[PDB]
From Swiss-Prot, chain A:
Protein name: Ribosomal RNA-processing protein 7
Family according to the record: Belongs to the RRP7 family.
Subcellular location: Nucleus, Nucleolus
Originating organism: Saccharomyces cerevisiae (strain ATCC 204508 / S288c)
A Gene Ontology BP annotation from the UniProt entry: nucleolar large rRNA transcription by RNA polymerase I
Main location: nucleus
Note: Present with 2610 molecules/cell in log phase SD medium.
Portion of the full-length sequence here: 3 to 189 of 297
Source taxonomy: Eukaryota, Fungi, Dikarya, Ascomycota, Saccharomycotina
Entry keyword rRNA processing: yes
Function recorded in the entry: Plays an important role in the synthesis of 18S rRNA but is not required for the 5.8S and 25S pathway. Is necessary for the cleavage at site A2. Is required for efficient association of RPS27 with the pre-ribosomal particle.
Subunit structure: Component of the 90S pre-ribosomal particle.
Single Gene Ontology MF annotation: rRNA binding
UniProtKB/Swiss-Prot annotation, chain B:
Signal peptide (from-to): none
Pfam families to which the protein is assigned, alphabetical: Nrap, Nrap_D2, Nrap_D3, Nrap_D4, Nrap_D5, Nrap_D6
Family membership: Belongs to the NRAP family.
GO molecular function: RNA binding
Function according to Swiss-Prot or TrEMBL: Involved in nucleolar processing of pre-18S ribosomal RNA and ribosome assembly.
Predominant cellular place of this UniProt entry's protein: nucleus
Keyword terms: Nucleus, Phosphoprotein, Ribonucleoprotein, Ribosome biogenesis, RNA-binding, rRNA processing
Other noteworthy facts: Present with 3260 molecules/cell in log phase SD medium.
Presence of keyword Chaperone: no
GO biological processes: maturation of SSU-rRNA; nucleolar large rRNA transcription by RNA polymerase I; regulation of ribosomal protein gene transcription by RNA polymerase II; ribosomal small subunit assembly; rRNA processing; tRNA export from nucleus
Name recorded for this polypeptide: U3 small nucleolar RNA-associated protein 22
Species: Saccharomyces cerevisiae (strain ATCC 204508 / S288c) (Baker's yeast)
Compartments where located: Nucleus, Nucleolus
Amino acid sequence: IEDISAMKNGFIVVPFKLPDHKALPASLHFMFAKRHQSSNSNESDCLFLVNLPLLSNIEHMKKFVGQLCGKYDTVSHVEELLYNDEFGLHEVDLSALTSPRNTALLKFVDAASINNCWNALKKYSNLHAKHPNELFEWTYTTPSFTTFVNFYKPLDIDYLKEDIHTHMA
Amino acid sequence: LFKSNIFKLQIDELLEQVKLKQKHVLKVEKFLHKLYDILQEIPDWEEKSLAEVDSFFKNKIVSVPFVDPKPIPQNTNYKFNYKKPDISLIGSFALKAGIYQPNGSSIDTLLTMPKELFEKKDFLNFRCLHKRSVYLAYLTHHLLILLKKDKLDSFLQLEYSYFDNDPLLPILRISCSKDYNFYKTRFSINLLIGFPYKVFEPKKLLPNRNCIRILPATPLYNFSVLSSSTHENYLKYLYKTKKQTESFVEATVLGRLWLQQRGFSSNMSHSGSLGGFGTFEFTILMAALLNGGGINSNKILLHGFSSYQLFKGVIKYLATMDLCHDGHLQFHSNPASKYIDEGFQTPTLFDKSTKVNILTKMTVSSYQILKEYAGETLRMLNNVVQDQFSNIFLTNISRFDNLKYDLCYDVQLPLGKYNNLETSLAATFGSMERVKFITLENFLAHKITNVARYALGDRIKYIQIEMVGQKSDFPITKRKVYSNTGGNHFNFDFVRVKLIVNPSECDKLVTKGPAHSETMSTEAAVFKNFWGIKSSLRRFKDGSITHCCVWSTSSSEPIISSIVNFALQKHVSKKAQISNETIKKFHNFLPLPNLPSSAKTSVLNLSSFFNLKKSFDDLYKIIFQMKLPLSVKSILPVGSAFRYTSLCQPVPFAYSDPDFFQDVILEFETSPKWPDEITSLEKAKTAFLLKIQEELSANSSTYRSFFSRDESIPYNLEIVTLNILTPEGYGFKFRVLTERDEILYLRAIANARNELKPELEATFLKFTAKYLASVRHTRTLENISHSYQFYSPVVRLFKRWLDTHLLLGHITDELAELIAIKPFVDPAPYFIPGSLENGFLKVLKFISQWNWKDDPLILDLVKPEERLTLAQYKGIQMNFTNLRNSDPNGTHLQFFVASKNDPSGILYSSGIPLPIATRLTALAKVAVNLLQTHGLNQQTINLLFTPGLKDYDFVVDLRTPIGLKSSCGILSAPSNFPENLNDLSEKMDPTYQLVKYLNLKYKNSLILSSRKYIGVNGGEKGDKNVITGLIKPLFKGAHKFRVNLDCNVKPVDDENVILNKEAIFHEIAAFGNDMVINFETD
């Protein structure tokens, strides 16, 4: 359990405690992360992560790096969370053909921040066996009774009409 | 030649399935050698009177089974004795027609009576029948002394019985209980006693002549009198008729196979049952068919023909040549058959040489009921596509009263004793009424069938008053069949009324009658008496005048459910209570729609659905003639309200139901200037609907407007649905269509590689069933329901029985409606579906034995006598055998539901998981097995809508913020929308999109199924649901190090990863945190 901090292919694990629930009875939600290797331009200082947390977004990777910034006395920032298709709505592009699942890409602004945050990532990976109470909990987003019917509500025609006029022009 | 030869291979092998061995007939005929020897020492005693007969038998073991009326010494002048009779063979074993049956049968060992023991006046005053009731107990008195002396009575028993379930001839039965051991053959020996051949005058014993002089015509009393003499001469006809036809016994075996399937045999039908014409009369009709049959004695069946020709032609003669109200059949055993075109208001098969009616055993209630199955079975011999041998006899049609009939009610008959019937029933029952129908089991059997005939009339297809609990056996040391059951002294516990209703007249409120005049006419005299205060003067729509009665409509019972209690109240029994508690609670499982006269709306009342079709037609009326840059050519909806497939009936202003907006697919003119990009395709067609919205916003202020994107297409996120709600309160989801939709889909398949070709093909099926094949099924959905509107009453509730058991989340409504429409186009071997109870019980048994691997679904979208041909339906069979190469057990292709329009089989049933389909059949296996084992009761009737949600690693109980049952149009309401139309979605089902994201992210590790109609499936509040979820089998074992496992898993070691349920339970919990109430974790 706690003795597996570094995998076989090198993926640094992220053990994090789950939040308490009214319908539940220290539960954990496990992620894997390692430095992605590619010669892409905008994918420099980016880490390909495996099995990100529930309802994670760009504010989830800045808050997690924020507690990572307070932990190991480091200073760093995140740029953007790339290709975070948790629902798979961009998993297939049907516009192209007519003309890595459950994984994410957390990109940093610079390699000076990304090397230090990955250095703290292996340091926070050792908290599984050394101090399991020091494992940072995942404050996941919770859908309210208002935003649940927000997909069922009608869209703003001020954004739909002017863009479809731009789609025709 | 393929209709005969493939039937002959299905006939020759099926006769080998029931192949009676010669070993079973060996010890059965050798035990008869011990019966013929022991009877040959049965001596004759002296002649004595009627008074001396009761003196010798009251202190003895044997007792006389005297039928009603018993003999009296004040009217008995003649004598009585026993004699050495001439025993002989008759029936199936004399014509070599017997076969192996598990339930057993009776061997008719006939004993001919001595001719000198009967006087010339033996036919009248029940004289010779008083000899037969005395001599049968006397022969049982002598044989039981002889069989005990041979020590065979340890496993042999003697008791009383009646021949052909007719009480006018007392007889004994010999059997074997668990050298002469016939207990391995299970054949029973019926010690039948018959009189000598025309020992009484056969001309004086015709149907129109009477033998109870104290007269009226005694057709049934002379039937038991005259046919007692024809046991030898008519059997001598079928003895030689077996030698003239090579397949006389083989076709009468298939005649015995077909007649046993529907409850027809040699048992009597005048006593309140179905029967009177079975294996005895069909082999007699096969003798008349192989000796002529025309109207001028021309040929009807051939002598040298095989079993494929003699079996089909006789039942077609039983269907097309009437014998009940239009004509009669003639026969002569002593010379062709020539059908008489005059009827006698009953079945009458004339034996011209023997003067007896061979069809006298069947009443008018049982005569026409076999003819509706005869034309059904003869049509199966006319079909050139489907296999019809299993559809005839190998499928039992007589199992359940709710299966072969539309409704059966328990009307208890607490009639008491016979002398108290002056206050029990309204009818006057004396000796003259009991002259021909002397048995009391038969007297109320046709009377209540005639009293219901004025009650229902043309509202049904037949009449069947069934005597439940009536047997045919009695003890030989007892008098007859006596019982204290049901608080009465009749030969039954009670009676049940069964009929197959025609839906075009079964719920008619205006009970029609004859025309009025200046004086009360004779035709108007009977209808005025039958209704009384219920009969009043009511005019017609076009100006006609007649006496009619208005009935009361209800959402739980039909119009005949009151008249079955009404007509049984007046002239049957004042204390009898008729009730149908099975189909009463069955209609309560459907959604009760919020409209006026909702409880006053019968199941046939479909005016609320077509009234929603008026508003959409008024909605399309502003759309069709409107000028845009591109003109419109097609304005059609493919929604479930116009196809009668919505689970909720269409009520106005109903925002909470999932089938509120009936889907619309519309088309413009043929255009090459459409863009050839998928994102640009829906960008252009929404602009023509934007000006069409701008034409609806300008001068059409009665109808509202809003936009929404339809995410039901995978990988298509540019589509837009136009939501227009009219002033009455009905909304439509309007989507355009052109020739570029299937162009972009098929170009996406061929351009993509071998990796991603499958998902863009299933998403092309999402564009096929919603745009390409949407209107094609919607055209035949409203069309063929005009032959059976009970499919629209059943398939709306069959999904409502499926939505209650967490099955709606994985299957579409079209494949659910085509499942319940299989017993509409192919109702064999049952009757036509005509009720919600008949429609649900037909789907309950058919989905039980629906093996998805061996036999696929090919249902013809054709009305009553458009279907695929023999070459086309065999092409539909080619889709099953090739798909089962790489999907043989139904794990990748289970439900192959095909028709004439979509013979691929996987239109609405592709991409669904196999494990939910395994429980979909298991919920069809356990629900139908509970009906036959524990009976059918309202404890079990609502239990089919009661799911336990077991075998669950996940079970989530939740409750929504606003109960939306009244908002969806369900009357346990909807009157207007808000000022802004965006706030109308605040009263929708929040678990619909909460479970939509559940199957979206966690598909590879969780199997998410849930309810989409929370308003009817919530109980009182209309917002409660439950979701059953199971883990995958591949993610149940340890999975090695990979990237694309797509499973929310944790670390189990340095080498393997496993899906930890702790984060898996919280992931669906942290999403629905506001709906978080309960979650079961195992």
